[PDB]
């Protein structure tokens, strides 16, 4: 009777995406998830899976799945992967080394750029330490680069921690916006609750 497909369109077809520093997470459970139709839903620039074989993803089951989504620029999609470094991986969104899941990305230049420029997608430029896997930093505290405290005011060695992307339609592809959805599969000592059609559960 569990003929309710998992609400993937809610995440993938969301009209607005989050900035990478404030990346969104959607909890998906208690439904059927076929990933073939995902890999056939549109033309994705990136569709990489780690930890489990992308051939028979449908024959697998998990406790629940988490769909994180955000926008970055093209040249940074490579940082959404295990063992990566860079401003995005270090300060914005970090995947673990033993990641088991899939990274899906597509070009959103038609949606997220505009003539004159869209500057409202931001990324974190400064942080005192690197993010642990899947942690999230939404703070806007002035970054104290030096020995003198900032008192919430920008100055030399006192920098606002976020910076705009400049998304214009004619940008080089490396500087065009890309929408990214990361699928994490949680394998917990508990009954499965997300299952593909092709598993013997169904």
């Amino acid at each position: 009777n569990i003929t309710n497909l998992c609400p993937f369109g809610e995440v993938f077809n969301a009209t607005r995406f989050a900035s990478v520093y404030a990346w969104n997470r959607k909890r998906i459970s208690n439904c059927v998830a076929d990933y073939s139709v995902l890999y056939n839903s549109a033309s994705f620039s990136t569709f990489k899976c780690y930890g489990v074989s992308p051939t028979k993803l449908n024959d697998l089951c998990f406790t629940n799945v988490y769909a994180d989504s955000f926008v970055i620029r093209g040249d940074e999609v490579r940082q959404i992967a295990p063992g990566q470094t860079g401003k995005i991986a270090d300060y914005n969104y970090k995947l673990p080394d033993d990641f088991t899941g899939c990274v899906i990305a597509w070009n959103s230049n038609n949606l997220d750029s505009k003539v004159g420029g869209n500057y409202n997608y931001l990324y974190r430029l400064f942080r005192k330490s690197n993010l642990k896997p899947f942690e999230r930093d939404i703070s806007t505290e002035i970054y104290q680069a030096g020995s003198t405290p900032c008192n919430g005011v920008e100055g030399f060695n006192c920098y606002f921690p976020l910076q705009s992307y400049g998304f214009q339609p004619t940008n080089g592809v490396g500087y065009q916006p890309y929408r990214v959805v990361v699928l994490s599969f949680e394998l917990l000592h508990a009954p499965a609750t997300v299952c593909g059609p092709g598993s013997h559960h169904h």
Partner: antibody, heavy 131, light 113 residues
């Protein structure tokens, strides 16, 4: 319409401090949208950014001049000011003030600062450094 | 001395097309930062000509256009008129060290007479 008017001493002796004042008309220097900047131009040469002040207290300086530059805002007179210490002959220039605005439709103004441009500009005031 | 490199002079006959380049590096124009152009008529203050690579403020005629590509940007002026003789400056942002606005060295445009 926004207009900016510079004012300062025309001549200053070397090692003194140059004090300049820019009066703003048609807008408030207490803006949380616009910033207020100083640019200079040595006679017959190019333009050089000095520094910018935003929302009364936030400052951004040309790194090669930062140790000599002080910017401030006076909300009661709707003006902002530049002080340049220990002037030498290299500081003889026309000094312009300008409004520095962010791109249109920006929610988080401080995050868009690298994409700001200058508009409008003041008339500029010539400062000669000589003893 | 300027971080953005412009040709010192460009010239064209009345009615011709003319371009002024502005080459930076991977720490300014190549890092994704916008290029703005200011026009300085002789004896006058600079004035905004192009903002955000290719946008015209109100009052700037159709004949002025801007673009950017890689580490470079370009100002194009079609239908050259005597009114256009001026010095043109590009300007961007450079993220190296603590970050700073940077200007080109300026280009004197001459309308051949």
């Amino acid at each position: 319409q926004v207009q900016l008017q510079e004012s300062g001493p025309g001549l200053v002796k070397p090692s003194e401090t140059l004090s300049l004042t820019c009066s703003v008309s048609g807008d408030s220097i207490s803006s949380s949208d616009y910033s207020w900047g100083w640019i200079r131009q040595p006679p017959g040469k190019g333009l050089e950014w000095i520094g910018t002040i935003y929302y009364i207290k936030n400052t951004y300086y040309n790194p090669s001049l930062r140790s000599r530059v002080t910017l401030s805002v006076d909300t009661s007179k709707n003006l902002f000011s530049l002080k340049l210490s220990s002037v030498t002959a290299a500081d003889t220039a026309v000094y312009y003030c300008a409004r520095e605005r962010p791109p249109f439709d920006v929610v988080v103004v401080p995050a868009a600062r690298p994409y700001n441009w200058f508009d409008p500009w003041g008339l500029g005031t010539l400062v000669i450094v000589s003893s | 001395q300027s971080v953005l490199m412009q040709p010192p002079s460009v010239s064209g006959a009345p009615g011709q097309r003319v371009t002024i380049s502005c080459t930076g590096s991977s720490s300014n124009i190549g890092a994704g930062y916008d290029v703005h152009w200011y026009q300085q008529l002789p004896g006058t203050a600079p004035k905004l000509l192009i903002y955000g690579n290719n946008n015209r403020p109100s009052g700037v005629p159709d004949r002025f256009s801007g673009s950017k590509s890689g580490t470079s940007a370009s100002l194009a002026i079609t239908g050259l008129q005597a009114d256009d003789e001026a010095d043109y400056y590009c300007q961007s942002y450079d993220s190296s060290l603590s970050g700073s606005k940077v200007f080109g060295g300026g280009t004197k445009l001459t309308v051949l007479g």
